[PDB]
Design a protein around this nucleic acid. Sequence first.
DNA 1: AGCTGCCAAGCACCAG
DNA 2: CTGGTGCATGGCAGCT
Lengths: 738, 791
Amino acid sequence: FYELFYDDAKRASQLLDISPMAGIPYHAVENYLAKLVNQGESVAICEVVRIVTPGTISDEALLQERQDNLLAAIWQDSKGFGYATLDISSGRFRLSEPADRETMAAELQRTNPAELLYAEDFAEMSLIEGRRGLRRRPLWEFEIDTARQQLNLQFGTRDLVGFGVENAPRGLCAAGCLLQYAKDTQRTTLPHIRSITMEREQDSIIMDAATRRNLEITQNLAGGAENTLASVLDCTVTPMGSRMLKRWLHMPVRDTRVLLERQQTIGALQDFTAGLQPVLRQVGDLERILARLALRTARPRDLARMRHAFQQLPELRAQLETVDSAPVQALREKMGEFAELRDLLERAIIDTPPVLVRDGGVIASGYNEELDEWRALADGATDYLERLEVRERERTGLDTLKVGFNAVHGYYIQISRGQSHLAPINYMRRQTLKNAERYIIPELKEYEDKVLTSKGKALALEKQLYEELFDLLLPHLEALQQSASALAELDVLVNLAERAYTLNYTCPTFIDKPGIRITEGRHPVVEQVLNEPFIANPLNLSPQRRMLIITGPNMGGKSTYMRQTALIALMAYIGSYVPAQKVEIGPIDRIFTRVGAADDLASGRSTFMVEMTETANILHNATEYSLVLMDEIGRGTSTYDGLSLAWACAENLANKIKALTLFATHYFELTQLPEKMEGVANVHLDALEHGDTIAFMHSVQDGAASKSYGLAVAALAGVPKEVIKRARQKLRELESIS
Amino acid sequence: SAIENFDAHTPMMQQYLRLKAQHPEILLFYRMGDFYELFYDDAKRASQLLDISLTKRGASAGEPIPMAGIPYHAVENYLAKLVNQGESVAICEQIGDPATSKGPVERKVVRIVTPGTISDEALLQERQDNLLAAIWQDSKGFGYATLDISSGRFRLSEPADRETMAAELQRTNPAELLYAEDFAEMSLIEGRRGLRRRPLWEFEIDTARQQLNLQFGTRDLVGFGVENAPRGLCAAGCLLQYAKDTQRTTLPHIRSITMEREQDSIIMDAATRRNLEITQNLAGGAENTLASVLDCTVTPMGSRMLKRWLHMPVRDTRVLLERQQTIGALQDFTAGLQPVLRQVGDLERILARLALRTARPRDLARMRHAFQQLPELRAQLETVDSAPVQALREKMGEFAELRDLLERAIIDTPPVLVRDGGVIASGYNEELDEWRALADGATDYLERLEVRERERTGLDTLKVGFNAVHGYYIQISRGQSHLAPINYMRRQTLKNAERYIIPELKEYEDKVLTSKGKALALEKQLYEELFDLLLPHLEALQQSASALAELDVLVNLAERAYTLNYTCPTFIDKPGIRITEGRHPVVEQVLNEPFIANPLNLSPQRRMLIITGPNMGGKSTYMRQTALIALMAYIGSYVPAQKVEIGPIDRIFTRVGAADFMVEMTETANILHNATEYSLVLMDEIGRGTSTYDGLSLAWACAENLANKIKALTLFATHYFELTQLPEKMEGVANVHLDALEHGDTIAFMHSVQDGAASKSYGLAVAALAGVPKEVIKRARQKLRELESIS
DNA sequence: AGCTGCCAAGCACCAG
DNA sequence: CTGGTGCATGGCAGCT
Ligand SMILES: Nc1ncnc2c1ncn2[C@@H]1O[C@H](COP(=O)(O)OP(=O)(O)O)[C@@H](O)[C@H]1O
Ligand SMILES: [Cl-]
Ligand SMILES: [Cl-]
Ligand SMILES: [Cl-]
């Protein structure tokens, strides 16, 4: 009668579509929780037993197979932002101290919690207000002292200088709240969470949210991983590899040595792609199975598949023996064999065990001698009762007699009605049905004790011998994790080498001065979805050629050449081969892309006001080591104010900063900077006006544009001949003051 | 792979396949026993759509048949899932009595559930219409028809071209759309939910004419006005054929067809309807729309009427004026009426289920309850001195006699279904009471028997009980079962009990049961006889429910007009809009900060207004509130202003920015082609260019065409100052702007419309504000100056 | 104050 | 031939 989640669940049924009285049936509860937790709801239920949150789940039902699922904690100190991100499924722990708001944007974009944690002291709500899975936390939780002790307790030693996170408090606070929230939901220790690291910005190539979205790295603009760079590159054969590949794409790195290693790896492995993958496909999501082992929730089929992986190691060892590559061999060693455990599990568990342990049938016969005997006793008792059925049927002549069973009455003999009158004298009746009568006899109950007590003693030992396995395997968890790390990395590398082969990517060769030198380069995502031949394009950007002014019609052609550039760098500085014939590329410290739509529109500020704020970010932070992409800025204001701003912008980018820029514009006036400035040149996109359409060429020729194709499109859109004729007049007369 | 000849299938499957063959594409619920079965693909597909298990049904030879199914009583929930996923289901039943059947009992498909023909409450949304529509492209134009099966509203139009057809579908939003196989222009239709590809022969004109006429019961269709709409009549032909084939009873509530023709309403293209946020916001939701502000109606059938009215503003003066002098007249009575109207409820659809002979007892319950409010409203509306309100009151009626019948026939507050008894109240039928006497007189007698026997035996635990299988029994705990009389014939056994029968008990079981069942079948006759009595007054009852709906809307609008402070607009001869203190009807309510009122003055002399200012400055709101004030005026409503004076309007255009290109250029082309001097046109960006003065040259030429030739009333907002040069060159084009001021370090917006073009575009000030380095802002200021030296 | 498995009813199966 | 059984999902009696 009283209360419940009914009122707050009519809320979430309103937003999953199942209906103050809405609900879910029992048989699909795990699938329905799978989508509330999906969109971030801290559930725990009863028509309390179990507790589940969106940031702390390990059940492979409730997690999306191919993507990370992080729990994170944020707070805005008087000085700066403190932030931490845990992967409850791998024990991958991150900690960070963003300085400015723009850094705290770029993290939240890259990382993307399914369950955020935040404090009252936090006043910059515009950063996280419209976020999935928001939870609110007190003062005490963000603590610095209990944190250290609780952290150092979790990990190992009496200090965190080994992890390198010691003299950075704002991050330790986040971490402190996070771990203590995560152990709470679990109500069990977390041995897999054995370390923690802090990314140092200065290492990775820095990409802000707007840049990270506009490139569509893991996520397209609409919301999916459809039609995105991941989609085209992720041909990995294990889920843990898929995850790793994505984390890699968002974290391109500047240590050109760490890259060169990955390039020589992709090289050596390029031939073994054929039969290195069908083996690796069978390693499965070991990284997550191992997490269910740490949390002691790993089901029979988790251990069965863990074993199946162990079978693939000597084969992978044997294949990677051939590979003449120092770093590939490091990964061969790190993959390990664990042959003793392979044997333990083969002996300890049958072919294909059931979904759950609850009802026995998991531990294979031979492993433990006690358990075998009990089964034979229980098969022993099962035997006589089958005999008894036959014994009794032919003895009485009643062909419809049956020995049956349920928890209500235990074992029972069942004659049908009509034949029921011929029931033996000693047959104690017990239960009449529409067309049957059920009896018991002294012997039956005697053997019923036999079957049940036998089963019960074997079934309760299965669970001991099972829980034992964990105490036998968990000591190695250390190495086991580094195996599934090494494996997931093979998946990724062996993929990045196959992709390079069957998409004809070249190997970029880095230079020490800033500059890009693409030769027949393409947008890695478009050249696949497009079913017409992709027109490749060149690019040269020495510091003698610092900025290209791109004029002529946009229509996607411009904002591709630009976007394909940023991706050929991204892909370079991630070690992967790149979609081109040759690519020499210099160091890049930051990638900026102010390209495409958007527009807010939630904050009442407009497109333009957005574009400028994005352009403000660029000008303030862009170094001579940065790539800068600027789709036709200056639209949506008076022709003069926008030309002045595009001029003023190009001026400061072409001189004060010097950054490697592609500057798209419609303004013809801007095509005079090659005459007024050092190191700035003109390129344009053509169109051909064939038949009854205009073909928007995507080929980048040199020089400014000598034609504007606006009126031309108007004619094709149905705009009356008379008006375009009158437009043409006014164009001519506006252009011949300029 | 097996050859399956007809004669090889088991007798059951033969009856299935000739039935499924009649419905090859849609799912088929095959009533078999207490379940509705599905088979083969129907079973696999149905298993996935419903989360029900797939299974086998055994065969002698050959592979077993796939099967899924659900119990006949759980049927609705599952129909609900399927209909809300756009699937149709054919509901097939058992006709004959299987006891008198040696072979398979006769089985017929009795109705078909489809997303466009649903009429039961549990499957429809209350505050929203759910229409079925048919679409047909001729050698010359289009034919489109709509039906509201749960109210009978059956309309017909013949859209001129691709773009109007686009308007209509956007507006009506049918939940199921019947198109001919040879439909030429498919980008109009594909994607849409509940599509239904119909064979060309279903759009035959003669069949349509003859079949519409049979249904309406007239010789020709001249009184309806649709005798000269061939194309329309066709789509209506197919829309009707479908309706009958889905329902499979007669449809007496579908009694009339009227025709929509564009001249009778302000036409509004897809973009316009979506941009004005009339019933759906810019981001899909129903929140912060014109209707969220206006709909405070108290019944669902009113909400839906208002929502329709909002989308089809009438141009006929008399209706408008009548509506006005009603809204005014009813200003004070908007507390006396409303809560009494609330209790009338969704009578519209209740009468639909009555038309279909499908109404549940509680539908009658709520129908009675609604009738009881009619003398309480009649006595209220008499007082009001309003010529139309009396006409509506006359229309509303009383149904003194029928309110009576429902008080005598049915109980206080009945169960959900008739199915198993308890609906018809005492004294309505003596024979039902005779059989209920026998029932009650046998039950209490059996309880006397309980006591009678407990003495006769002394056994204290003796009970009398009833179980569905065995029936009436005498229960003795096993602890005393031995002490049971020799009279007692043991019938059922349990673990701690033993149940018996005696020929007295079984004699009175057979009387209580036989008499209970005679009551049931009699209630079921009595209940299905109510329809026979009420149906004769369907027409009168329908137009009453209509009058209650319209009143619900008008009463609401009156209250709205008071609560939110609107004024009555007046209409003029010439085109024009003269607004005094014109505020945005939705944006004024969502704000906390008092909404700045703002005038407007458009006439044939002053027909275009170039709106300068900066973005964020309030430019769009101004344009939008202009169209919204116009639309409300033209549904008869009061207006969010002080004094609004408005000329005849035929269309309202919207070219407000953001594509998804080429789009914006077409929507512009659409305006230039179809705009007359009675239309209102609101534009943000007519289309971008690819060079500096490229696209700007279009805007100029277009403004010129709208001003010189079309002479539409235009509101053109723009940042391009080259266009504030237009009032100098062009006749009847003026300059206005939204005021903003820089107080040094930041910038504020006045939201007030001033004459003359803005002092400057604040492009640079906004960039500065956005964070662009002072450093660079300065540079731009210098480059500006030199541009204005030659300008 | 839950859970378990009989049963609903048509028709086909199939073991005696 | 006769008398048993299978087979969807839901409801309730018969048991803790
Ligand atoms: N008359 C007004 N009074 C008060 N606020 C207004 C008024 N007009 C507009 N606003 C507010 O100004 C904001 C921007 O208005 P909008 O018309 O979108 O500007 P623009 O069209 O120039 O970009 C809106 O969010 C609205 O809340
Ligand atoms: Cl058992
Ligand atoms: Cl009507
Ligand atoms: Cl502006």
